[PDB]
Amino acid sequence: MKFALQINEGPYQHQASDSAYQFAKAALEKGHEIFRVFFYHDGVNNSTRLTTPPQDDRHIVNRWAELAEQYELDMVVCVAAAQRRGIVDEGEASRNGKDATNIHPKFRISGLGQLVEAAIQADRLVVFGD
């Protein structure tokens, strides 16, 4: 089947992102398709490349990126939620007058419509939050 995954919380603060990762990995190993991984609310914070977590524990951002590389996942970050919280890519930096970017290259910033779109295309919508 095809899955649409929604993550609503930031990395580390809540287990949501970790649970979503383990679910995704397990689903992907079973041959199921993950149509899109959508980050909303504080979930957008799972896309920053500026984290330097302790080396003796998991690196949530890089781990998601590695999974996306291996399975060619479409990881989308809500633009509205990103603007409110400080997740910026090249386009946003120019449009919003920022002198730096912080998004991880494996993630893309897009509209909330990509979430609804995935819910329509996927067989199941699995939400991870608080």
Partner: protein, 132 residues
């Protein structure tokens, strides 16, 4: 084609879930799917009338709920048990109008208070549930 349910269970302002959840409903309107918005538990507080946020330094987003009818949302449900547990009645909630130029329907309020069995039924009819 699909039946989408928006499950609202958190009170407004304390967290952003109420506002950002509302944002999804507005966006989803353009996809012309079958939609219903359910307010359960503290979610019923999202529909209280007379909200005034000048004292907390935040924008009052309550007016947006009253525009839902303009975004083709015809089915808005409120759990009656949740209202009672909070000493609220439908009189404490805002009215949400709905008008369709083609069918001539013009309703002053489409917010419907329903019982627990109906809530469970609506859940069983959904193809996807958005939670926040």
């Amino acid at each position: 084609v699909k039946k989408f349910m928006y499950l609202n269970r958190k009170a407004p302002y304390g967290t952003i879930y109420a506002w950002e959840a509302l944002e999804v409903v507005l966006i989803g309107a353009a996809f012309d799917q079958d939609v219903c918005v359910l307010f359960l538990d503290d979610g019923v507080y999202q529909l209280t009338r007379g909200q005034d946020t000048k004292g907390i330094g935040m924008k009052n987003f309550s007016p947006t709920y009253r525009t839902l009818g303009d975004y083709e949302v015809r089915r808005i449900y409120v759990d009656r048990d949740s209202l009672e547990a909070r000493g609220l009645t439908q009189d404490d909630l805002v009215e949400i109008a709905f008008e369709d130029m083609e069918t001539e329907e013009e309703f002053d309020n489409i917010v419907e208070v329903i019982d627990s069995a109906r809530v469970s039924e609506l859940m069983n009819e959904s193809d996807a549930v958005f939670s926040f």
